[PDB]
A = this chain, B = another copy of it.
Amino acid sequence: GKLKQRSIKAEGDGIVGEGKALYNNEGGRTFMYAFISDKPDLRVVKWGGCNTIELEPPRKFLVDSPNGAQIKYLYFVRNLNTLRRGAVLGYIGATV
């Protein structure tokens, strides 16, 4: 549950937008957990190894910047196990 974040950019059929990729490597080898962006409607992140990484429909949430609360969008990678889903949320609402 000790987790790392990266700026990467993403694609919607639309559409493109920057964001926050939270991910983890093991041992050893690397795999991304969730994506957090300013904008809805994204479908994919491009990730050795170039990877096609597909997101779930985002789950929206409020967050507090000193320029008004902005709304952020949270995209889990497909078929993430509930456990790591949890881990995400855990970390998320933990950045305060």
Nearest 5 pairs between A and B by C-beta? A90-B90, A86-B86, A1-B89, A2-B93, A1-B93
Q: What are 29 A-B contacts with C-beta separation under 8 Å? A: A1-B86, A1-B91, A1-B92, A1-B93, A2-B92, A2-B93, A3-B90, A3-B93, A3-B94, A82-B82, A82-B83, A83-B83, A83-B85, A84-B86, A85-B86, A86-B87, A86-B89, A86-B90, A87-B87, A87-B89, A87-B90, A88-B90, A89-B90, A90-B90, A90-B91, A90-B94, A91-B91, A94-B94, A94-B95
Contacts of A87 in B (CB 8 A): 86-87, 89-90
Apart from A82-B82, A83-B83, A94-B94, list 6 A-B contacts with CB within 8 A: A1-B90, A84-B86, A87-B90, A90-B91, A91-B91, A91-B93
